[PDB]
Amino acid sequence: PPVHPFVAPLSYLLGTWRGQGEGEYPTIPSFRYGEEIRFSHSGKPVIAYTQKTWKLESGAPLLAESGYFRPRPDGSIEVVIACSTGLVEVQKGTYNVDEQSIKLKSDLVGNASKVKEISREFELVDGKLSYVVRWSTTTNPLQPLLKAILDKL
Amino acid sequence: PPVHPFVAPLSYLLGTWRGQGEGEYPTIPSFRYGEEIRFSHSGKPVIAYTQKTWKLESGAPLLAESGYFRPRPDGSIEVVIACSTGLVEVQKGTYNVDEQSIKLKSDLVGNASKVKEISREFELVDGKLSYVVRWSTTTNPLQPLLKAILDKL
């Protein structure tokens, strides 16, 4: 199917990406992980997102998440994500075509009593997908949790 | 990877399923659809769920959803689902090993102002996967929306 006009501005996402990231947070010593993301579509105004992470040494599975990105021609976007840990997120924000960036903040975090807000920001940098995920909790203001850079395969 | 002990009681789900369903609701004339579901795992206490639907005549894509099922040895289960329409659900309930059934009710429906609660009930019937999805809205009490039966491939 052809790319829907609402998806076309984010067509640079479509494909598979692999790289690595790092986590850290006040309660949590730093950790590293491998990551793969696939963005795909079926001609609708939606991009399917699927992700997985693993241990760098061994390739042992860690976590997974999946969901859907819904861009609109005014530059707005909403994203819904379910995670293997049992969290869900409703993310809303904007994409910028000149910067090839997407900036999202949660409207809702479900099933995760301690995390309050989550933000996710993506940017294409020299053709690589970078992101930052920030979390807040009741006692920790919004701050980085995860950062990763992935190459397009 | 081997099946995690918490997933083993739901091992009958693992695989791909294809069949058809029907929708209907007070505001909505009846419609039919084809459906495919895949349940998979990576050795963790989680089953990945992915689903899609299509028009019966043509195979044209309709909707998609995906998420994660987290069974526990006491018979409890939580399920998180993101949908291509932009909804998210946190489902909680129980599974019954003798009946090969799973019965879920939403704790949370996100990003869908009019739908209030969603229930999902699965049952293996002569080896086929059947379900019923019920919805409530502010003015319509919980009642069937979708029902489908799928054969294991």
Side-chain angles (χ1 to χ4, degrees):
Chain A
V3 179
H4 188 284
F6 297 180
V7 168
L10 295 186
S11 65
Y12 67 86
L13 293 173
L14 299 169
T16 305
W17 304 80
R18 190 173 306 108
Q20 65 186 276
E22 194 178 323
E24 194 167 357
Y25 205 73
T27 250
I28 305 174
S30 60
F31 59 90
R32 292 188 190 265
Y33 54 94
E35 185 170 3
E36 186 170 312
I37 294 171
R38 179 167 180 252
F39 288 108
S40 60
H41 76 97
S42 55
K44 305 295 182 215
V46 184
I47 305 170
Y49 160 74
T50 64
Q51 182 263 205
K52 65 188 176 173
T53 56
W54 60 84
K55 291 188 203 159
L56 293 171
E57 332 75 52
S58 63
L62 291 167
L63 296 173
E65 65 188 26
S66 61
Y68 299 94
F69 283 52
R70 291 166 60 69
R72 284 198 59 97
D74 64 357
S76 67
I77 181 169
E78 66 175 16
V79 170
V80 289
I81 296 171
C83 308
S84 68
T85 63
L87 274 200
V88 300
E89 302 172 33
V90 180
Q91 286 286 353
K92 302 194 172 192
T94 58
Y95 67 88
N96 184 316
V97 161
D98 297 319
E99 299 190 356
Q100 294 173 304
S101 65
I102 302 172
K103 293 183 171 198
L104 301 167
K105 293 176 52 182
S106 54
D107 257 20
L108 177 165
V109 175
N111 207 39
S113 71
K114 291 210 180 204
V115 183
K116 291 301 172 166
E117 297 81 42
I118 301 170
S119 71
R120 295 184 179 236
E121 299 188 352
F122 297 87
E123 183 186 2
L124 198 70
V125 284
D126 198 26
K128 304 186 188 305
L129 187 64
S130 70
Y131 69 73
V132 180
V133 174
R134 295 171 166 86
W135 280 14
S136 66
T137 72
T138 300
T139 61
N140 299 291
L142 187 72
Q143 61 190 276
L145 176 63
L146 307 176
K147 61 181 45 79
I149 302 169
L150 301 89
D151 289 340
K152 195 168 198 298
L153 305 177
Chain B
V3 179
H4 188 284
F6 297 180
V7 168
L10 295 186
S11 65
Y12 67 86
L13 293 173
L14 299 169
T16 305
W17 304 80
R18 190 173 306 108
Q20 65 186 276
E22 194 178 323
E24 194 167 357
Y25 205 73
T27 250
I28 305 174
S30 60
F31 59 90
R32 292 188 190 265
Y33 54 94
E35 185 170 3
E36 186 170 312
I37 294 171
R38 179 167 180 252
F39 288 108
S40 60
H41 76 97
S42 55
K44 305 295 182 215
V46 184
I47 305 170
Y49 160 74
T50 64
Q51 182 263 205
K52 65 188 176 173
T53 56
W54 60 84
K55 291 188 203 159
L56 293 171
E57 332 75 52
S58 63
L62 291 167
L63 296 173
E65 65 188 26
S66 61
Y68 299 94
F69 283 52
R70 291 166 60 69
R72 284 198 59 97
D74 64 357
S76 67
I77 181 169
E78 66 175 16
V79 170
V80 289
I81 296 171
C83 308
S84 68
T85 63
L87 274 200
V88 300
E89 302 172 33
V90 180
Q91 286 286 353
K92 302 194 172 192
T94 58
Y95 67 88
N96 184 316
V97 161
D98 297 319
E99 299 190 356
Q100 294 173 304
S101 65
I102 302 172
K103 293 183 171 198
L104 301 167
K105 293 176 52 182
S106 54
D107 257 20
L108 177 165
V109 175
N111 207 39
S113 71
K114 291 210 180 204
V115 183
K116 291 301 172 166
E117 297 81 42
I118 301 170
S119 71
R120 295 184 179 236
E121 299 188 352
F122 297 87
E123 183 186 2
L124 198 70
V125 284
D126 198 26
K128 304 186 188 305
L129 187 64
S130 70
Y131 69 73
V132 180
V133 174
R134 295 171 166 86
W135 280 14
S136 66
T137 72
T138 300
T139 61
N140 299 291
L142 187 72
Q143 61 190 276
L145 176 63
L146 307 176
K147 61 181 45 79
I149 302 169
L150 301 89
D151 289 340
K152 195 168 198 298
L153 305 177

